[PDB]
C-alpha cells in the first residue's frame, strides 16, 4: 500500500470511528451472533495477492462489529472505564508512525523529555509532593508504564534491590539467597490480584492484611510487620490501595505510609482507578499521607480519557528500579492540552455525581441496599436477602439486553456493581439503568 491509498483508507476510517462513537447508543449491548460465527465469514488462508482497502473497510460492519462488545456504550457498565478520547486516538496515529517498542535503546531527546515534562504537568495536577516532581531538581520523577500491574511489580523489584543493598551493607557475611529468602511484602486482603502476581514474580513472601470495613488500617499493617520480624523475616514492601477493585474502598494511607516509613518498608500506592479523581481538590483528602509514599501509580487509561496504555508512576528515587518507550507521553500531552484541566475535573465530577444519583435511586427502593459506601464512579448494591436471588437478578438483567452490569463478592456478600464507564454517560442514563434494574426485580417477584 502506497501513501495515496493509505490516505483514502485512513480518512475513511476517521469517518467510520466518528460515526461509530457519536451514534453508539444505537448499538445493542448483547451480540446477536453466536460463538463460532466468524470463521465461516472469512477465507481459510491469507491472500496471495493484495486485497482492496475498500473491501477490508466493508468487512468491519459485516464481520467485526456483530461480534464486538461495546465498552463505550453508556448502557454498558464494565468493571471500570476504558479510556477513549479523540485527542488520544490522534496522538496514537502519530506514535504508530514514529515510536518503537524499545528493543534498541532509545537515546531520543523528544521521547524522554516530553515524558519528564508530562509527568510534571500531571504530578502538579494531582498536587503531588515536590519530591515526586522532576522540576523540583531532586532525585524524584515519573515514568509512564503500560499497566498498574507492571507498576506494582517494578516497585516491588526496586524495593527488593533496595532492601538487598541495605541488608548486605549491614551484614556483608550474608549471601544474597539468604537475604532474599527472608523478604516479606504486605497488602490489604482487598488489594488487586496484581499484587499477588508481583509477589510471585518477585520471588518474595506476601502477607494479606485483614481490612476493616474494606480498608487497611495502620495498626493491622504494623501488627503483621512485627510478627514477621519476630520470626526473623525482613519486611521490605507494602502496597496501599486507594480505590479497591471490588468496592472502590480506600486504605488509610495516612496511617499505613508512616508505619511503612518507620519500619523501613517501601510504600507503593496503587490508585489505578480512583487516582484520576485526585486532580479535583475535593477528593485529594483521599491520598492524605502521600508524602510517606516511595511510589505512586494511577492509570489515566481508566478514568482520565487517555487511551491505553498509560499507567503513570512517580517515584521518590526512579533509579532504584527506561524512558520514552512507545512515546506514550504524546497522547498524554494531546489529552491534557485539548481537554485542559477544567474539563478533566468536570469529567470526574460528573461521573461522581452520576454514581451518587444512581445510589439515591437504588436506596429509595426499600427492596435494595448498598453493599458498600458509594465512592467515585462506582455503586455496589444488592437486593436485601440472599446471594442466590442477587445472582438471579444479575443474570436476568444481563439477559434482558438493555444494560450490562457485573458482579462482585466480598466475604460471603455477593452484590452487583454499576460503574460509570462511558465518557458519553448523561444523568438520564442513571434513571434508565435504575429503572431497568427495578423492572428486572419486579419480574423476579412476579415469577409467582
Rounded CA-CA distance 368/434 in Å is: 11
CA dist 116 → 102, 259, 298, 394 (Å): 17, 30, 16, 45
Determine if 29 is a binding residue for a second copy (CB under 8 A): no
Stretch that binds a second copy, among 120-128, 167-175, 261-269, 290-298 (CB under 8 A): 120-128
Determine if 120 is a binding residue for a second copy (CB under 8 A): yes
Stretch that binds a second copy, among 107-115, 348-356, 363-371, 388-396 (CB under 8 A): 107-115
Rounded CA-CA distance 23/18 in Å is: 8
CB of 263 to a second copy, least distance (A): 25
Of 326, 390, 329, 286, nearest to 141 (Cα)? 329
Task: State which of positions 364-383 bind a second copy (CB under 8 A).
Answer: none
Tell whether residue 95 is among the known ligand binding residues.
no
Determine if 117 is a binding residue for a second copy (CB under 8 A): yes
Task: State which of positions 300-319 bind a second copy (CB under 8 A).
Answer: 301-302, 307-309
Task: State which of positions 333-352 bind a second copy (CB under 8 A).
Answer: 333-334, 336-343
Task: State which of positions 199-228 bind a second copy (CB under 8 A).
Answer: 200-203
For CA atoms 260, 261, 263, 266, the dihedral sign is positive
Rounded CA-CA distance 126/314 in Å is: 11
CB of 154 to a second copy, least distance (A): 12
Choice among 192, 214, 268, 351 that is catalytic: 192
Among residues 291 and 309, whose Cβ is nearest to a second copy? Answer: 309
CA dist 441 → 26, 257, 437 (Å): 25, 44, 6
Stretch that binds a second copy, among 46-54, 257-265, 284-292, 429-437 (CB under 8 A): 46-54
Rounded CA-CA distance 151/153 in Å is: 5
Determine if 98 is a binding residue for a second copy (CB under 8 A): yes
CB of 236 to a second copy, least distance (A): 17
- Asked if omega into 309 is within 30° of 0 (cis), the reply is yes
Rounded CA-CA distance 25/212 in Å is: 40
Among residues 104 and 446, whose Cβ is nearest to a second copy? Answer: 104
Please report where in the chains the cell 460492519 appears, as a residue: 61
Tell whether residue 148 is among the known ligand binding residues.
yes
CB of 55 to a second copy, least distance (A): 8
| Number of residues engaging a second copy in binding (CB under 8 A) | 108
Stretch that binds a second copy, among 26-34, 364-372, 386-394, 439-447 (CB under 8 A): 26-34
Determine if 415 is a binding residue for a second copy (CB under 8 A): no
Catalytic residue flag (residue 192)? yes
Pairing of strands 368-370, 141-145: unpaired
Among residues 96 and 138, whose Cβ is nearest to a second copy? Answer: 96
Q: How far is CA 243 from the centre of its chain?
A: 10
Tell whether residue 264 is among the known ligand binding residues.
no
Pairing of strands 266-270, 295-298: parallel
Determine if 399 is a binding residue for a second copy (CB under 8 A): no
Task: State which of positions 221-280 bind a second copy (CB under 8 A).
Answer: none
Which one of residues 147, 208, 353, 438 is an interface residue with a second copy (CB under 8 A)? 147
Of 275, 278, 328, 279, nearest to 306 (Cα)? 328
Rounded CA-CA distance 286/250 in Å is: 7
Rounded CA-CA distance 45/378 in Å is: 45
Tell whether residue 85 is among the known ligand binding residues.
no
Binding-site residues for substrate, in ranges, read: 82, 192
Query: Residues with catalytic annotation?
Result: 192
Amino acid at each position: 500500500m502506497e501513501a495515496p491509498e493509505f490516505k483514502d483508507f485512513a480518512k475513511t476510517m476517521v469517518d467510520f470511528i466518528a460515526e461509530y462513537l457519536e451514534n453508539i447508543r444505537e448499538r445493542r449491548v448483547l451480540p446477536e451472533v453466536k460463538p463460532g460465527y466468524l470463521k465461516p465469514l472469512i477465507p481459510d488462508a491469507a491472500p496471495e495477492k493484495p486485497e482492496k482497502w475498500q473491501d477490508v473497510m466493508q468487512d468491519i460492519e459485516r464481520v467485526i462489529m456483530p461480534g464486538v462488545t461495546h465498552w463505550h456504550s453508556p448502557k454498558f457498565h464494565a468493571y471500570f472505564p476504558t479510556a477513549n478520547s479523540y485527542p488520544a486516538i490522534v496522538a496514537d496515529m502519530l506514535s504508530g508512525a514514529i515510536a518503537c517498542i524499545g528493543f534498541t535503546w532509545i537515546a531520543s531527546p523528544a521521547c524522554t523529555e516530553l515524558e519528564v515534562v508530562m509527568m510534571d504537568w500531571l504530578g502538579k495536577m494531582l498536587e503531588l509532593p515536590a519530591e515526586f516532581l522532576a522540576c523540583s531538581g531532586g532525585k524524584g520523577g515519573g515514568v509512564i508504564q503500560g499497566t498498574a500491574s507492571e507498576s506494582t511489580l517494578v516497585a516491588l523489584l526496586g524495593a527488593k534491590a533496595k532492601k538487598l543493598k541495605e541488608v548486605k551493607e549491614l551484614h556483608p557475611e550474608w549471601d544474597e539467597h539468604t537475604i532474599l529468602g527472608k523478604l516479606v511484602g504486605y497488602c490489604s486482603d482487598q488489594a488487586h490480584s496484581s499484587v499477588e502476581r508481583a509477589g510471585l514474580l518477585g520471588g518474595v513472601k506476601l502477607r494479606s492484611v485483614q481490612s476493616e470495613n474494606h480498608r487497611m488500617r495502620g495498626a493491622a499493617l504494623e501488627k503483621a510487620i512485627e510478627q514477621d520480624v519476630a520470626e526473623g523475616l525482613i519486611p521490605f514492601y507494602a502496597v496501599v490501595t486507594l480505590g479497591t477493585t471490588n468496592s472502590c474502598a480506600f486504605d488509610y494511607l495516612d496511617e499505613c505510609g508512616p508505619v511503612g516509613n518507620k519500619h523501613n518498608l517501601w510504600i507503593h500506592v496503587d490508585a489505578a482507578y480512583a487516582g484520576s479523581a485526585f486532580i479535583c481538590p475535593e477528593y485529594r483528602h483521599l491520598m492524605k499521607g502521600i508524602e510517606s509514599a516511595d511510589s505512586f501509580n494511577f492509570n489515566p487509561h481508566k478514568w482520565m480519557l487517555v487511551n491505553f496504555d498509560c499507567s503513570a508512576m512517580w517515584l521518590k528515587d526512579p533509579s532504584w528500579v527506561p524512558l520514552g518507550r512507545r512515546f506514550r507521553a504524546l497522547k498524554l500531552w494531546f489529552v491534557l492540552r485539548l481537554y485542559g484541566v477544567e474539563n478533566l475535573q468536570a469529567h470526574i465530577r460528573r461521573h461522581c455525581n452520576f454514581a451518587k444519583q444512581f445510589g439515591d435511586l437504588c436506596v429509595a427502593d426499600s427492596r435494595f441496599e448498598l453493599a458498600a459506601e458509594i465512592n467515585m464512579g462506582l455503586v455496589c448494591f444488592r437486593l436485601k436477602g440472599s446471594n442466590e436471588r442477587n445472582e438471579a437478578l444479575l443474570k436476568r438483567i444481563n439477559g434482558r439486553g438493555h444494560i450490562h452490569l457485573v458482579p462482585a463478592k466480598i466475604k460471603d456478600v455477593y452484590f452487583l456493581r454499576m460503574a460509570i464507564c462511558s465518557r458519553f454517560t448523561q444523568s438520564e442514563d442513571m434513571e434508565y439503568s435504575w429503572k431497568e434494574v427495578s423492572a428486572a426485580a419486579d419480574e423476579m417477584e412476579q415469577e409467582q
